[PDB]
Design a binder for this molecule. Structure first.
Ligand SMILES: COC1=C2C[C@@H](C)C[C@H](OC)[C@H](O)[C@@H](C)/C=C(\C)[C@H](OC(N)=O)[C@@H](OC)/C=C\C=C(/C)C(=O)NC(=CC1=O)C2=O
Ligand SMILES: COC1=C2C[C@@H](C)C[C@H](OC)[C@H](O)[C@@H](C)/C=C(\C)[C@H](OC(N)=O)[C@@H](OC)/C=C\C=C(/C)C(=O)NC(=CC1=O)C2=O
Lengths: 213, 213
């Protein structure tokens, strides 16, 4: 059974700003995702310096992108530290974030949306291309859980009994907007990664499905 | 919680024959898989001729092959009719199969293992390349279940709360033997499909993971 939580009030305004004031350079949503994935991977690796067993739930360190064009879904998986239920609730919307108001004021004064990660709120850039998001996460210290939002004022957290097991880490599952289906394409993905994600210490894999001809 | 079932006694001998008398032309295991997938897809499509709603749990008709080299696993998914719990128990080992004994006698007299599907027992050819198998299946008339065997005299059936949801159909998950890892390779898979699976009415997709370079 899901629990429902209410977003802290400036997070709700930030999301509705991102959905509705919008327009240009939406592709930076993937740079923010990859940069969060890389932060999560840095954390497990640093953690494991003095607790090597932490690594054993998923020994390989990677970022993987899987288009699912039939569901209009883009998934980005990392094998980073992952998040517990309580981390999903606290850190993904119930507690105020330090740069939320400041980024909104920056935006209104003319700042590029691209600055969003410098405000510590770049996760919310995913609503540029998606009207719905699931974050499926598995921390070594908890069970697998699904966080879900349609950017509507509330989110749900649900013990995961429906998705593949990740050994450890997170899957970001974007239900893309009908106008943003270009991010389902191999060539577009590669261009965006090569443009804004050149210096990443982890391998970035792309999963492509082709017909045997 | 899993239930355990015992294999009918000639199925156990067939499996241990396949594991141990062996040697040559192991690649026909994929022709048998694809041919079963195609039979399952024919059945849903025929069924839907007079009950079109059956199709709506998974509108696309396909066979998909996904190597997972890090787990030494080959998955083959179809969106065919799927099987209920009771069909997995009955049809995947507890009840005697008509050609089991006859195929064993044919084999001993010198028959090519390749004849196995002409005896109606070709599912068991997967133990040529795998020491363990899961069949994860979702029929419109039941929940998702996992059947599992290590070819040891018994199998388990378990309500699925750990794998991705299939809308409808089956995933064959092969834990390949260390000597049979060639079936993890894109080029080998394609050769085997092109050789023995030329006339298939459904698209066969291959899922390939590559590093963004
Ligand atoms: C310092 O780390 C970062 C923080 C502080 C805090 C949340 C860290 C978090 O604590 C529980 C974990 O330490 C860390 C492993 C999890 C992230 C990197 C997640 O990424 C994935 N792939 O796990 C990302 O997932 C949706 C979650 C929230 C982001 C908020 C809404 C924001 O937008 N920006 C941030 C980007 C960051 O790099 C941020 O606030
Ligand atoms: C006539 O159909 C076939 C039968 C008769 C009977 C089992 C049919 C089954 O009834 C419940 C469903 O109608 C059908 C949709 C399911 C299969 C095609 C499955 O394939 C997948 N992809 O679903 C395959 O899965 C592991 C299962 C068992 C095979 C036994 C051990 C054997 O080896 N060979 C057979 C190959 C066949 O084509 C066989 O006995």
């Amino acid at each position: 059974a899901s629990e429902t939580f209410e977003f802290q009030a400036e997070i709700t305004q930030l999301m509705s700003l991102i959905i509705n004031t919008v327009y240009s350079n939406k592709e930076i949503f993937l740079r923010e995702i990859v940069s969060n994935a890389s932060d999560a991977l840095d954390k497990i690796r640093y953690k494991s310096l003095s607790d090597p067993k932490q690594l054993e739930t998923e020994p390989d360190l990677f970022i993987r992108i899987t288009p699912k064009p039939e569901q209009k879904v883009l998934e980005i998986r990392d094998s980073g530290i992952g998040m517990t239920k309580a981390e999903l609730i606290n850190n993904l919307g119930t507690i105020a974030k330090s740069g939320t108001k400041a980024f909104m004021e920056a935006l209104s004064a003319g700042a590029d949306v691209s600055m969003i990660g410098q405000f510590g709120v770049g996760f919310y850039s995913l609503f540029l291309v998606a009207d719905r998001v699931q974050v499926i996460s598995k921390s070594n210290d908890d069970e697998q859980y699904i966080w879900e939002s349609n950017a509507g004022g509330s989110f749900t957290v649900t013990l995961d009994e429906v998705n593949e097991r990740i050994g450890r880490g997170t899957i970001l599952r974007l239900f893309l907007k009908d106008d943003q289906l270009e991010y389902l394409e191999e060539k577009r993905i590669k261009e965006v990664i090569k443009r804004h994600s050149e210096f990443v210490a982890y391998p970035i894999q792309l999963v492509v499905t082709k017909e045997v001809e």
